[PDB]
Amino acid sequence: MELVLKDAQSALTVSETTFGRDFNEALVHQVVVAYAAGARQGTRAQKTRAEVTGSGKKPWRQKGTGRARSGSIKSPIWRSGGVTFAARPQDHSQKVNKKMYRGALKSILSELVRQDRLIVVEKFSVEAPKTKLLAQKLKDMALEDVLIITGELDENLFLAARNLHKVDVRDATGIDPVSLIAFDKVVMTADAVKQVEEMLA
Amino acid sequence: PKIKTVRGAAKRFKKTGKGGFKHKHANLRHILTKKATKRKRHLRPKAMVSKGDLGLVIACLPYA
Amino acid sequence: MRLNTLSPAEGSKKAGKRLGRGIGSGLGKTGGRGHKGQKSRSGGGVRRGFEGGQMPLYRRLPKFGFTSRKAAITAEIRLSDLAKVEGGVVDLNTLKAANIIGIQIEFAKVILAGEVTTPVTVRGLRVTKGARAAIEAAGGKIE
Amino acid sequence: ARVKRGVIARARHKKILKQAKGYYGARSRVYRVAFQAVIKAGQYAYRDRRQRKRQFRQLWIARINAAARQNGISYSKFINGLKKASVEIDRKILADIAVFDKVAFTALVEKAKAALA
RNA sequence: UAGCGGCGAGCGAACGGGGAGCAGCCCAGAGCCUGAAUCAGUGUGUGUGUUAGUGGAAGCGUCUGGAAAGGCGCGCGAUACAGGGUGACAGCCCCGUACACAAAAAUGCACAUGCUGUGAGCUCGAUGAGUAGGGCGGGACACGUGGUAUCCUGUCUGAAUAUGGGGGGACCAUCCUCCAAGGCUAAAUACUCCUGACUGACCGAUAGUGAACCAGUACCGUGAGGGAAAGGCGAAAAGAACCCCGGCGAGGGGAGUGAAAAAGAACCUGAAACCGUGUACGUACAAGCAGUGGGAGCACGCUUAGGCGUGUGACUGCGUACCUUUUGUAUAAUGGGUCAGCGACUUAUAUUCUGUAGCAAGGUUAACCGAAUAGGGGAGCCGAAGGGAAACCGAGUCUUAACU
Ligand SMILES: [Mg+2]
Ligand SMILES: [Mg+2]
Ligand SMILES: [Mg+2]
Ligand SMILES: [Mg+2]
Ligand SMILES: [Mg+2]
Ligand SMILES: [Mg+2]
Ligand SMILES: [Mg+2]
Ligand SMILES: [Mg+2]
Ligand SMILES: [Mg+2]
Ligand SMILES: [Mg+2]
Ligand SMILES: [Mg+2]
Ligand SMILES: [Mg+2]
Ligand SMILES: [Mg+2]
Ligand SMILES: [Mg+2]
Ligand SMILES: [Mg+2]
Ligand SMILES: [Mg+2]
Ligand SMILES: [Mg+2]
Ligand SMILES: [Mg+2]
Ligand SMILES: [Mg+2]
Ligand SMILES: [Mg+2]
Ligand SMILES: [Mg+2]
Ligand SMILES: [Mg+2]
Ligand SMILES: [Mg+2]
Ligand SMILES: [Mg+2]
Ligand SMILES: [Mg+2]
Ligand SMILES: [Mg+2]
Ligand SMILES: [Mg+2]
Ligand SMILES: [Mg+2]
Ligand SMILES: [Mg+2]
Ligand SMILES: [Mg+2]
Ligand SMILES: [Mg+2]
Ligand SMILES: [Mg+2]
Ligand SMILES: [Mg+2]
Ligand SMILES: [Mg+2]
Ligand SMILES: [Mg+2]
Ligand SMILES: [Mg+2]
Ligand SMILES: [Mg+2]
Ligand SMILES: [Mg+2]
Ligand SMILES: [Mg+2]
Ligand SMILES: [Mg+2]
Ligand SMILES: [Mg+2]
Ligand SMILES: [Mg+2]
Ligand SMILES: [Mg+2]
Ligand SMILES: [Mg+2]
Ligand SMILES: [Mg+2]
Ligand SMILES: [Mg+2]
Ligand SMILES: [Mg+2]
Ligand SMILES: [Mg+2]
Ligand SMILES: [Mg+2]
């Protein structure tokens, strides 16, 4: 696979089992679903009828009153009774396999290069951490929604992209399919291309 | 958690190769002079369970 | 390719029965359980190996046999496993390092199953007649 | 999630009550009885889409019987005479002719009589 | 799993392996170095944290509107576009946050380290007795006296003591290993009446604690205890000056503030049952699950007059509610006075089967590390080989003396 740059007009070579395969809709959908379901924090609880703070007596006797049969004021059919099927702090972490997750990432990288949305550059660099300069540079490069996944660590770009509300700055290691799908124009450093060809092999 | 195995069924069956279950025969423990000799000669070898009861012993031995 | 248009494969996500939610739900006012049984009562059902009050099958039949301590600690090794071990020599410590039998395996066997090509020098392992003939046809030195 | 369900019950009960306007009594304001009135009314509509053709067949037959006996023949002899002269004019048309335009019905009566005799 | 088990219901290890964390010493006592390691307690100095805090960027003109934070155009900040207000949705109006600092005083802590007790260090000796075991009766180990190891003791008994003894799952002999009958010990681990920050595919007033409110209050009970209801004017009270009816009242009508009073405190929205008023039609010779099919008339709305719809429905054919339980219901068998709100197949961990995705004689990791949904971790699990009670054999194996 022969990627062409823009700001250097060079050409990177990465193999088609990493950047040239076919888009697997079911696999990428399952990994996106499992990513959101692992992102779910999930801390709710309701009061069981074993947990509602009440008495334990029958509110009236069983036979001989014109009222209904009732034997706990805590009952889930009453007013201010328990939730019938009360929830719990739980763990919803779906488990995608290692080769499934890597196949999803291979699939969306191939889909990004086929749909022509992964602008590759030789490096990304700002002098001082000025977000005014970063938005200036991004308007020069003519992008609005942009994911810049970095070849090497650039804490100046961390500082310059912390406050922009459409730009995202990552590592090539810490990438994720929710980001790599949702962001409209993914900008990749050539060093990040080398690191992800290592990462998927 | 883990399903408990009915230990009576684990001590009275074995799971064979293709999937069926084998077991020892009945009526071979005591009074045995009034029984014949070909009855005991055919109650000797272990043999397989039938169609219907295989689901019951699968429910008692869930861990194969 | 946006985030919303990631529709699954047609056949993945099943519906899932919601029991007791109307007439057109199919699973109507009883919820698959019938009428007035013991299997219809909440928390109803019978335990495993229950055939009414009579003897269950695992109490009619008699026991047989014990279990030996020597059985679980002796494992079989296919001939295709001997191309997994790195070094061209097969012994128990080399195999237990090569993740073939496991740390709790003292005695072992070699079975005619699968094909071996390279020369392999089996030491200290009991080998069967077919597997031993296959090894000495491959160029091994069984002892 | 806590799905609160006020608006769903309001939409459903409003639809059934709007279907049940016009009925007498608490069967147009109560919901628990307007549902029975709606379901039993739809049941009667399903029965009466079969019964209406029975009733109008009997009405046309009675009208043709009256006009035929005013022209000197019974209805059964009339219909056998028409099938023997090979006329396929059905009895809705025959009864409508018998009411609106009676000299054509006298034409039908004479053709049936000339067939049957 | 191995076992325990009226061998039923069920109870259920360990050996071993991967991780978290890892810290070892003293009295059983004398000489001789004679104060060095050491910990505990008491203090001066540094640094850090808490209990007040401080600074903290950057916007205007117009149309709508009651009011602009809205639409329109035009700019600027951003290590701050987390959030909460502000007369409608504000990075640039305010409070903030990012960041950068600040504590005279008490202070938790890392200590720099003084003081008071404290002695490491060397050699020789000492090696925990009514104790280990034993009989009886119990109890804990997964182990219910079972062939029952091992541990604790209510009672009677009772040694050897380093050439000695305990154990190695009845027991005996070799071997292996270890040295009870006296102590102390950080960490990983359990928990939240609390004190802060932060998040919520958590609730939004019959929910969430019982309690959004002056609630364990009213109230009930002798007493232990039981235990409610009850949020919303507006943007700001601008909470109706005045006049009139009335009883120097209640309540209203005009005026007034008001974007709004059909927002006026009995206050946003204002549904349903229920109760009336006004209008059209029907109804005082008529029999019954009250509808449905037909259908004249009347009135109201429309136009190629024609045509219709909408409201009513005289008269007429048919027509014995709904649920449940039933062999069976109009049943005179059960339940419901009606409305509105709540109300009942869920969740966790394993297993089997089907569908679909990944890889395919391979598939996969769990804890845990890792500012961390990535990647390591292959300890393990399942599958590729079965037969046998079992040793053992192995594409065969068992039965059998041997099987065609
Ligand atoms: Mg009591
Ligand atoms: Mg309450
Ligand atoms: Mg509650
Ligand atoms: Mg992982
Ligand atoms: Mg016997
Ligand atoms: Mg059905
Ligand atoms: Mg029932
Ligand atoms: Mg029954
Ligand atoms: Mg039944
Ligand atoms: Mg129950
Ligand atoms: Mg019996
Ligand atoms: Mg292994
Ligand atoms: Mg809600
Ligand atoms: Mg009405
Ligand atoms: Mg017909
Ligand atoms: Mg300040
Ligand atoms: Mg400011
Ligand atoms: Mg407003
Ligand atoms: Mg000792
Ligand atoms: Mg002593
Ligand atoms: Mg003693
Ligand atoms: Mg003793
Ligand atoms: Mg003993
Ligand atoms: Mg004892
Ligand atoms: Mg002992
Ligand atoms: Mg032994
Ligand atoms: Mg409310
Ligand atoms: Mg409440
Ligand atoms: Mg007044
Ligand atoms: Mg009121
Ligand atoms: Mg409002
Ligand atoms: Mg109001
Ligand atoms: Mg109302
Ligand atoms: Mg009349
Ligand atoms: Mg009457
Ligand atoms: Mg009609
Ligand atoms: Mg009955
Ligand atoms: Mg039935
Ligand atoms: Mg009947
Ligand atoms: Mg009745
Ligand atoms: Mg009656
Ligand atoms: Mg009954
Ligand atoms: Mg009932
Ligand atoms: Mg009743
Ligand atoms: Mg209701
Ligand atoms: Mg519900
Ligand atoms: Mg399942
Ligand atoms: Mg498959
Ligand atoms: Mg054979």
Terminal CA-to-CA distance of chain D, rounded, Å? Answer: 85
Q: How far apart are CA B13 and CA B49, in angstroms?
A: 9
Q: Pick C7's closest partner by Cβ from A25, A111, A178.
A: A25
Q: What crossing angle do the helices spanning D91-100 and D31-70 adopt, rounded to 10°?
A: 70
Residue C68 CA, nucleotide E170 C1', distance (Å): 19
Instruction: Report how far apart, in Å, the C-alpha atoms of C20 and of each of C34, C41, D40 are.
Output: 12, 14, 24
Find, among B31, B30, B29, B26, the residue nearest to C58 by Cα.
Answer: B26
In chain A, where the domains are located? 2-200
Closest-CA distance of chain A to residue C89, Å: 32
What stretch of H or E contains B54? Answer: helix B54-60
Q: How far apart are CA C126 and CA C137, in angstroms?
A: 17
Q: How far apart are CA C126 and CA C116, in angstroms?
A: 17
Query: Closest nucleotide to residue C59 (Cα to C1')?
Result: E8
In chain D, where the domains are located? 1-117
Q: After which residues is chain B broken (C to N over 2.5 A)?
A: none
Long-range CB contacts for residues C20-27, cutoff 8 Å, separation at least 24: none
Q: How far apart are CA A156 and CA A178, in angstroms?
A: 25
* SS3 (DSSP) at B47: strand
C13: its two tokens: 């996500």
Fold for the domain defined by A2-200: Ribosomal Protein L4; Chain: A; (3.40.1370)
Q: How far apart are CA C53 and CA A177, in angstroms?
A: 58
- Name residues 172-191 of chain A within 8 A of C (Cβ): 178, 181-182
Residue B60 CA, nucleotide E382 C1', distance (Å): 21
Phi, psi (deg, nearest 5) at residue C76: -95, 150
What stretch of H or E contains B59? Answer: helix B54-60
Q: How far apart are CA C38 and CA C55, in angstroms?
A: 20
In our burial notation (b when 16+ CB lie closer than 10 A, e otherwise), range C14-26 reads eeeeeeeeeeeee
In chain B, where the domains are located? 1-64
Q: Chains with ≥3 Cβ pairs under 8 A against A?
A: C
Provide, as residue numbers in chain B, all residues whose Cβ is less than 8 Å from the Cβ of C63.
Answer: 11-12, 24
In chain B, which ranges are E strands?
14-15, 21-23, 47-48
Please give, one letter per residue, the 3-state secondary structure of C67-131: CCHHHHCEEEEEHHHHHCCCCCEECHHHHHHCCCCCCCCCEEEEECCCCCCCCCEECCCEECHHH
DSSP C53: B
User: Is the separation of the CB atoms in B28 and B40 below 8 Å?
Assistant: yes
Query: In residues, how long is chain A?
Result: 201
Look at strands B47-48 and C126-127 and give their pairing: unpaired
Give the CA angle between residues C101, C102, C108 to the nearest 5°.
40
Find, among C86, C124, C79, the residue nearest to C106 by Cα.
Answer: C124
Sheet order of strands, C74-78 included: C74-78, C107-111, C126-127
Place of tokens 């490069």: A141
Sheet order of strands, A146-150 included: A118-121, A185-189, A146-150, A167-171
Cβ-based neighbours of C106, under 8 Å, separated by 6 or more: C73, C74, C92
Provide, as residue numbers in chain B, all residues whose Cβ is less than 8 Å from the Cβ of C59.
Answer: 8
Q: How far apart are CA A22 and CA A109, in angstroms?
A: 10
Give the CA angle between residues A11, A13, A17 to the nearest 5°.
145
Ligand nearest to the backbone CA of D4: 13
Instruction: Report yes or no: C58 at the B interface, CB cutoff 8 Å.
Output: yes
Nearest residue (CA) to C1' of E364: A97
Q: How far is the CA of A44 from the centre of ligand 13 (A)?
A: 14
User: Is the separation of the CB atoms in A188 and A118 below 8 Å?
Assistant: yes
Side-chain half-sphere CA neighbours of A39 within 13 A: 10
Backbone angle region of D72, left / alpha / beta, with phi > 0 → left and psi within -120 to 50 → alpha: left
Find, among D93, D47, D95, the residue nearest to D68 by Cα.
Answer: D95
* SS3 (DSSP) at B58: helix
Find, among A90, A81, A23, the residue nearest to A48 by Cα.
Answer: A81
Name the experiment that determined this structure.
cryo-EM
Q: How far apart are CA C11 and CA C19, in angstroms?
A: 22
Q: How far apart are CA A199 and CA A180, in angstroms?
A: 15
Phi, psi (deg, nearest 5) at residue B2: -65, 140
User: Is the separation of the CB atoms in A177 and A28 below 8 Å?
Assistant: yes
Q: Do C49 and B11 touch (CB under 8 A)?
A: no
Place of tokens 């550059």: A121
Provide, as residue numbers in chain C, all residues whose Cβ is less than 8 Å from the Cβ of B25.
Answer: 61
In our burial notation (b when 16+ CB lie closer than 10 A, e otherwise), range A85-108 reads ebeeeeeeeeebeeebbbbbbbbb
Residue A158 CA, nucleotide E78 C1', distance (Å): 13
User: Is the separation of the CB atoms in C117 and C80 below 8 Å?
Assistant: no
Phi, psi (deg, nearest 5) at residue C126: -75, 130
Please give, one letter per residue, the 3-state secondary structure of chain A: CEEECCCCCCEEECCHHHHCCCCCHHHHHHHHHHHHHHHCCCCCCCCCCCCCCCCCCCCCCCCCCCCCCCCCCCCCCCCCCCCCCCCCCCCCCCCCCHHHHHHHHHHHHHHHHHHCCEEEECCCCCCCCCHHHHHHHHHHCCCCCEEEEECCCCHHHHHHHCCCCCEEEEECCCCCHHHHHHCCEEEEEHHHHHHHHHHHC
Q: How far apart are CA D13 and CA D24, in angstroms?
A: 18
Q: How far apart are CA D81 and CA A21, in angstroms?
A: 84
User: Is the separation of the CB atoms in A5 and A122 below 8 Å?
Assistant: yes
* SS3 (DSSP) at D111: helix
CA atoms D13, D16, D18, D24: torsion sign: negative
Q: Pick C49's closest partner by Cβ from B9, B11, B25.
A: B9
User: Is the separation of the CB atoms in A20 and A27 below 8 Å?
Assistant: no
A155: its two tokens: 């804490």
Q: Where are the alpha helices (DSSP H) in chain D?
A: 6-19, 31-70, 75-84, 91-100, 102-116
Q: How far apart are CA A15 and CA A20, in angstroms?
A: 7
